[PDB]
Amino acid sequence: SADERQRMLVQRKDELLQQARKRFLNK
Amino acid sequence: AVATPEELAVNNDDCAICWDSMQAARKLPCGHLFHNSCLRSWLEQDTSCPTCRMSLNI
Amino acid sequence: AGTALKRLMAEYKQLTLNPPEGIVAGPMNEENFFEWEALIMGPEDTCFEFGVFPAILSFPLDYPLSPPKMRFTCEMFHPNIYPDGRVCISILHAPGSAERWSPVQSVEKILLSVVSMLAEPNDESGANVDASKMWRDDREQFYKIAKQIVQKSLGL
Ligand SMILES: [Zn+2]
Ligand SMILES: [Zn+2]
Numbered sequence: 661s662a663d664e665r666q667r668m669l670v671q672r673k674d675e676l677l678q679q680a681r682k683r684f685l686n687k
Numbered sequence: 688a689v690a691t692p693e694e695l696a697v698n699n700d701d702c703a704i705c706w707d708s709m710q711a712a713r714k715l716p717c718g719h720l721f722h723n724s725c726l727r728s729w730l731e732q733d734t735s736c737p738t739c740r741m742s743l744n745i
Numbered sequence: 746a747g748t749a750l751k752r753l754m755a756e757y758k759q760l761t762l763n764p765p766e767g768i769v770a771g772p773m774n775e776e777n778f779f780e781w782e783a784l785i786m787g788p789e790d791t792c793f794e795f796g797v798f799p800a801i802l803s804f805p806l807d808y809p810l811s812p813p814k815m816r817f818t819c820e821m822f823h824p825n826i827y828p829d830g831r832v833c834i835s836i837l838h839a840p841g842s843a844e845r846w847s848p849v850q851s852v853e854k855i856l857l858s859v860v861s862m863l864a865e866p867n868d869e870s871g872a873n874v875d876a877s878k879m880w881r882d883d884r885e886q887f888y889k890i891a892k893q894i895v896q897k898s899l900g901l
Contacts, residue, residue: 662775665761672769673784677797680767680786681899684795704809704848705748706755729848732810733840737847 689713689723696722703737704729716745749808753778756852768856770802779804781813785856791864792891796898800832800859802852809848812837813855819898822890824868824877833870834858 689711696712704725711723717739721729734742757771757778767786772778781802787793799818805811815837817830825833835844836858868877879887 665771666775668761669769669771672764673782676767676769676784676786677899680795680797681901683789684895684899684901687795706752728810733845735840735842735845735847737849740843740845740847 688727695720716743717741747806748810749804749806750778752809753804757781759853765853765856767797768860770852770856779806781852783815783856785860785863787863787895788860792888793863793895796863796895798898800830809850812839812846812850813852815855815859820894822873822876822887822894823863824866824873824880825862825870827872831872832859833872834862835869 691713693710693712695714696708696710699712699720700708702709702722702725703719704721709722709724712720713723713726714720715726715736717736719736719738729737736743753772760770767788768784770781770783770785773780773782781804783800783802785798785800787796787798789795798821801816801818803814803816805813815832817826817832819830821830827833836850836855837846838844839846866876866880868880871877876887876890879890
């Protein structure tokens with residue numbers, strides 16, 4: 661509901677970022 | 688300004704401008720279905736059809 | 746709950762239903778669908794690959810009759826982006842001419858144009874002249890600064 665999605669979203673932004681980092685470096 | 692039957696509105700229960708569903712649907716010369724109330728507002732903002740990028744001369 | 750609210754809410758719903766790779770966007774708060782945060786990660790094989798770029802999208806009240814104000818919250822080196830972070834693209838160009846703003850342009854499509862401009866920096870507006878000139882004058886130096894921006898965005 662109100663904040664169920666809010667946390668979910670924050671997770672996607674966090675993950676994505678951490679992924680880019682793992683990538684950029686492992687590249 | 689709507690000469691198109693309501694059946695067309697029931698067929699195309701959406702809008703690319705205002706979204707949602709309305710009964711006052713009108714067919715544009717570019718082969719698009721837009722509600723008159725939405726078209727009126729857009730016709731005052733511009734004269735080019737969204738999914739066409741071309742100005743209508745009719 | 747007018748046109749803007751209905752449309753904006755539907756767009757976010759889809760963004761959480763079918764999410765694109767490297768594209769995390771949505772409103773900052775459920776009680777505020779006028780301020781969206783977009784996390785766009787530069788696509789691989791480009792000069793901005795792995796770049797998790799944070800951008801702020803301020804939407805208008807007559808949406809989608811008017812385009813949203815997209816501004817980067819981080820440093821950038823793109824010709825189509827002002828030094829202040831304001832993005833300048835024909836797709837977001839309100840007419841009050843091949844590419845212009847249209848109510849049919851959803852946020853998803855808006856982001857697509859940005860990603861495309863990141864892969865193919867086509868200076869049409871001329872916001873960051875320092876970059877616009879360098880892009881044509883020295884492609885090597887451009888790539889150097891471009892990749893450097895990636896380090897700064899990722900935080901490395
Ligand atoms: Zn059309
Ligand atoms: Zn409509």
